[PDB]
């Protein structure tokens, strides 16, 4: 945003223009997939799930 | 001069409906803001009426501006700088000026050029945005029928 | 300056997502507001986060 806000022209930008949500959605997806904490949920009885 | 229910043109977001005159005082001064929304990105803009013309809010134009930009749209001998990036920067500044005649010049130039050649994706998106805001102003000026304004726009473009 | 997160309904129920291999999602919405300091405007939108 601060790389974009200074560079582009004033009285033409809008919050849709300044905001790139792609790092946010990529960050959540790379947490949920591919982290050592978001585990494949082990269930072969209810107790192992619990 | 701005009142509730008016229709006004805000640069560079085309048409704009005012909603109310916001009496939010701040810094000890009665900042008479006015909540003013567009239809493109659904963004509500509040500008104070003191510097509304300083930011360059502008009322819609009637039949004189209509046939004026029809004449400028019909105006032949459209010339351009030969460098395409100079051309693009020129029409970009003309579009960012927000003047309706400059918008008409830009859309008639880009329509005359891709109507002759078929230009670009960047020039295509340029023409799309400029045609969108000019169609919005012409739907405000003819007070109705954005699709009919589109059709009569494509009619007068062929002349 | 952002403001006010919000959630829609989920895009798909649980068993449908578990069948069709979609992730069980729900869309965010953030009321983002831009202010210009020198002239003074607000730009209140609804950014799909």
Between helix B63-74 and helix B146-158 the angle, nearest 10°, is: 40
Contacts of A7 (CB under 8 A, 6+ apart): none
Whether the Cβ atoms of residue B113 and residue B119 lie closer than 8 Å to each other: yes
Q: Determine, for residues A14 and B11 on separate chains, whether the beta-carbon distance falls below 8 Å.
A: no
CA atoms within 13 A on the CB side of A21: 13
CB-based contact C46 B42, cutoff 8 Å: yes
> How determined?
cryo-EM
The answer to whether A25 and C48 have CB atoms below 8 angstroms apart is no
CA distance B130 to B78: 17
Closest of B127, B60, B40 to residue B92, by C-alpha: B127
User: Gaps after which residues in chain A, C–N over 2.5 Å?
Assistant: none
Cβ pair B45:C45 closer than 8 A:
no
As a whole number of angstroms, the distance between CA B108 and CA B89 comes to 16
> Using the 8-state DSSP alphabet, how is residue B75 labeled?
-
CA–CA dist C41, B34 (Å, integer): 10
Query: Torsions phi, psi of B58, nearest 5?
Result: -150, 130
Contact C49, C29 (CB under 8 A): yes
State the Cα–Cα distance between residues B53 and C24, nearest whole angstrom.
49
Instruction: Name C7's bridge partners.
Output: C28
| Calpha distance A43→A24 (Å, rounded) | 30
Sequence-separated contacts (24+) of B35-40 with Cβ below 8 Å: B36/B8, B36/B10, B38/B10, B38/B13, B38/B14, B39/B14, B39/B15, B39/B136, B40/B13, B40/B14, B40/B132, B40/B136
SS (H, E, C) B81-120: CCCHHHHHHHHHHHHHHCCHHHHHHHHHHHHHHHHHCCCC
Any chain A CB within 8 A of the CB of C47?
A: yes
Q: Does C44 touch chain B (CB under 8 A)?
A: yes
Taking alpha carbons only, the member of C6, C10, C39, C33 closest to residue C22 is C10
> Considering Cα of B78, then B84, then B87, then B88, what sign does the dihedral take?
positive
CB-hemisphere CA count at 13 Å for A19?
20
Nearest CA of chain A to the CA of C24: how many Å? 12
Distance of alpha carbon A49 from its chain centroid, rounded? 27
A11 close to B (CB below 8 A): yes
Chain C partners within 8 Å of B43 (Cβ): 43-45
Q: What are the chain A neighbours of B13 within 8 Å (beta carbons)?
A: 14
- Measured between CA atoms, the residue of chain C closest to residue A19 is C47
Task: Report resolution in angstroms.
Answer: 3.6
> From CA B75, how far away is CA B124, in angstroms rounded?
21
- Interchain pair C45, B41: CB under 8 A: yes
**Is the backbone peptide bond immediately before B12 cis, with ω within 30 degrees of 0?**
yes
> What is the three-class DSSP state of B45?
strand
Question: Which among A10, A13, A14, C42 is positioned nearest to B48, based on CA atoms?
Answer: C42
**Residue A9 DSSP one-character state:** P
**Closest CA in chain C for residue A16:** C47
- Count residue pairs from A and C with Cβ separation < 8 A: 23
């Amino acid at each position: 945003v601060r790389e974009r806000m200074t560079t582009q022209d004033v009285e033409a930008i809008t919050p849709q223009t300044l905001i790139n949500i792609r790092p946010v959605v990529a960050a959540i997806k790379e947490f949920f997939g591919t982290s050592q904490l978001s585990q494949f949920m082990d269930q072969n009885n209810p107790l192992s799930g619990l | 001069i701005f009142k509730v229910g008016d229709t006004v043109v805000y640069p560079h977001h085309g048409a704009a409906l005012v909603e109310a005159i916001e009496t939010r005082t701040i810094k000890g001064e009665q900042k008479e803001y006015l909540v003013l929304k567009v239809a493109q990105g659904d963004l509500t803009v509040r500008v104070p009426a003191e510097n509304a013309e300083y930011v360059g809010v502008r009322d819609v134009v009637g039949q004189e501006g209509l046939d004026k930009v029809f004449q400028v749209l019909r105006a032949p001998h459209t010339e351009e700088p030969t460098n395409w990036s100079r051309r693009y920067k020129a029409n970009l500044e003309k579009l960012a000026s927000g003047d309706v005649n400059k918008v008409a010049e830009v859309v008639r130039d880009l329509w005359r050029r891709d109507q002759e050649r078929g230009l670009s994706a960047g020039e295509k998106r340029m023409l799309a945005k400029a045609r969108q805001i000019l169609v919005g102003e012409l739907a405000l000026a003819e007070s109705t029928d954005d699709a009919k304004a589109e059709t009569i726009l494509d009619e007068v473009l062929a002349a | 300056s952002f403001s006010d997160p919000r959630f829609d309904d989920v895009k798909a129920p649980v068993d449908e997502c578990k069948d069709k291999d979609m992730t069980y999602a729900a869309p965010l919405f953030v009321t983002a507001e831009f202010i210009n300091n020198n002239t003074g405007e607000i730009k209140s939108q609804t950014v799909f986060m």
